[PDB]
Amino acid sequence: EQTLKERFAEIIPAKAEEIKKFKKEHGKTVIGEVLLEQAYGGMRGIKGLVWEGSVLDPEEGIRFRGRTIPEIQRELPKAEGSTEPLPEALFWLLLTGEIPTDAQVKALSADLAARSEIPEHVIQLLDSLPKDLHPMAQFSIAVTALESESKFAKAYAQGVSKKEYWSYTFEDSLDLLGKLPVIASKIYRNVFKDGKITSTDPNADYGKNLAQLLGYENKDFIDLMRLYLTIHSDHEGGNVSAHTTHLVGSALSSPYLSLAAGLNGLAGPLHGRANQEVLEWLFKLREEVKGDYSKETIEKYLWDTLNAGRVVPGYGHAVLRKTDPRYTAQREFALKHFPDYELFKLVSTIYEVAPGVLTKHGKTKNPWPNVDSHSGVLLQYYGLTEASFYTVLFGVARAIGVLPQLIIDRAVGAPIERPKSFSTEKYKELVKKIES
């Protein structure tokens, strides 16, 4: 059957031609207005980016090439003996819009595992970084250190034509994706454990190699990694990690430098730390109520939080009107595997009572939980308790989402990203003219 590169090579010309015709025929159609408040508001609402793999449906949650989370759980292939969707099969879907067969996904997993060795200078660099250097900084350093392997950088220097760009971007992307479990696990073992790391299993799927390289052989934790990577993979192109990866890649930096920049965005505490923010809040709550998770006690705790002007982390959305389906998938994992874990009893009781309290309080739109309200409890159950590592796991997952878009951007010839700035003095002059 076709490999991923072969299938993409077959289908992308017609999709590129469709976009070219769409741009030419409808490019002058006005699709929105820019308000002054949007320039001073982080470009919120500006329809300015093209991102093929996922789109938020305000009524149903994030969709991956049109599929909801439960549809992805049904349709993607599974490792034998598992019902979790394989994240490398999601990588295939995000890049092509198509579901791979069992045999296709098996060959992609073996290709990723064969590309997973990291060079000596990167092993050395990692082993020497200080333990107080945050795991996200270690992760982006190691990915940037792989730039000497970039096949795209070398092809650009040799003057290849633009038609060949996506092929080299694809090779760097699979090489980089293959290496992330080894980099992430080396950081984990060095900072938090004994510095000793096992070797990639050539016949394992991607989440399974991640779990085992971190040092976790429990079969249910392997299933958690498969699910965690799939659901954290992508969430449109306007979030800071996807956007930064795309922006840096638009200047033709390789996937290594582009993902490293994206990881530095994910490292920002307004983007990548919500799992740890929820966990800290839950731990403080658990201590402060001495484990009393009665509805009365939890309800009071939420009111005392809100009356103090503090947030209930991980609840509320500007747009999505129901629980995030990525939260539900993790709730369903806990109900099947450990429904009586005490920290889960707390998370589940908050889900029962917080929406109603937040509604009555009246200041939270769509007071339902997101993915980050449920991820930490699952990691804790299996002993992965080092919360300063959790955004590294998120970064491995987010590479599954952002690397396909770099490959598609190069196949379709997306140009350098270059919005326009002005100073406040000049915006005031422009506004005065407009209002005249």
Contact residue for Cl ion among 239, 253, 258, 276 (CB under 5 A): 239
Burial of residue 352, with CB atoms counted within 10 A of its CB: 0-12 exposed, 13-18 middle, 19 or more buried? exposed
Name the residue nearer to a copy of itself (CB basis): 40 or 303. Answer: 40
Task: Please tell me whether residue 269 binds a copy of itself under the rule CB under 8 A.
Answer: yes
Measured distance CA(71)–CA(240) in Å, rounded: 26
Q: Quote the tokens at residue 62.
A: 């994030």
Residues with Cβ within 8 Å of residue 34, at least 6 apart in sequence: 46
235 is catalytic: no
Between helices 206-214 and 219-232, what is the axis angle to 10°? 120
Task: Please tell me whether residue 295 binds a copy of itself under the rule CB under 8 A.
Answer: no
Contact residue for a copy of itself among 1, 13, 42, 291 (CB under 8 A): 42
Question: If we measure between CA atoms, which residue out of 179, 176, 183 comes closest to residue 126?
Answer: 183
Task: Please tell me whether residue 283 binds a copy of itself under the rule CB under 8 A.
Answer: no
- Where does this chain touch a copy of itself (CB under 8 A) — which range of 137-145, 197-205, 299-307, 336-344? 137-145
Contact residue for a copy of itself among 9, 11, 12, 39 (CB under 8 A): 39
The residues facing 369 across adjacent strands are: 315
Using CB under 5 A as the binding rule, the residues of this chain from 125 to 184 that contact Na ion are 130, 132
Contact residue for a copy of itself among 6, 10, 13, 40 (CB under 8 A): 40
Per partner kind, with CB cut-offs from 5 to 8 A, the member of a copy of itself, Na ion, Cl ion, none near residue 124 is a copy of itself
Name the residue nearer to Na ion (CB basis): 130 or 309. Answer: 130
Task: Please tell me whether residue 235 binds Cl ion under the rule CB under 5 A.
Answer: yes
374 is catalytic: no
Task: Please tell me whether residue 435 binds a copy of itself under the rule CB under 8 A.
Answer: yes
Residues with Cβ within 8 Å of residue 338, at least 6 apart in sequence: 344, 381
Catalytic residue selected from 232, 235, 246, 317: 317
Name the residue nearer to Na ion (CB basis): 80 or 132. Answer: 132
Burial of residue 53, with CB atoms counted within 10 A of its CB: 0-12 exposed, 13-18 middle, 19 or more buried? buried
Contact residue for a copy of itself among 90, 118, 229, 247 (CB under 8 A): 247
Question: If we measure between CA atoms, which residue out of 91, 75, 55, 143 comes closest to residue 408?
Answer: 91
Tell the residue number behind the tokens 């469709």, with chain if given. Answer: 18
172 is catalytic: no
Q: Quote the tokens at residue 400.
A: 């599954």
- Where does this chain touch a copy of itself (CB under 8 A) — which range of 1-9, 237-245, 324-332, 361-369? 237-245
Task: Please tell me whether residue 147 binds a copy of itself under the rule CB under 8 A.
Answer: yes
Per partner kind, with CB cut-offs from 5 to 8 A, the member of Cl ion, Na ion, a copy of itself, none near residue 28 is a copy of itself
Question: If we measure between CA atoms, which residue out of 123, 132, 139, 141 comes closest to residue 196?
Answer: 123
Report, in Å, the least distance between residue 160 CB and a copy of itself. Answer: 12
Residues with Cβ within 8 Å of residue 369, at least 6 apart in sequence: 314, 315, 323, 324, 327, 350, 351, 354
- Where does this chain touch a copy of itself (CB under 8 A) — which range of 31-39, 212-220, 299-307, 344-352? 31-39
Using CB under 5 A as the binding rule, the residues of this chain from 269 to 328 that contact Cl ion are 271
Half-sphere exposure of 17 (CA within 13 A, CB side): 5
Task: Please tell me whether residue 189 binds Cl ion under the rule CB under 5 A.
Answer: no
Task: Please tell me whether residue 267 binds a copy of itself under the rule CB under 8 A.
Answer: yes
Residues with Cβ within 8 Å of residue 283, at least 6 apart in sequence: none
Provide the binding-site residues for Na ion, judged by CB under 5 A: 130, 132
What amino acid positions are annotated as catalytic residues?
Answer: 271, 317, 372
* Positions that interact with Cl ion (CB under 5 A): 235, 239-240, 271
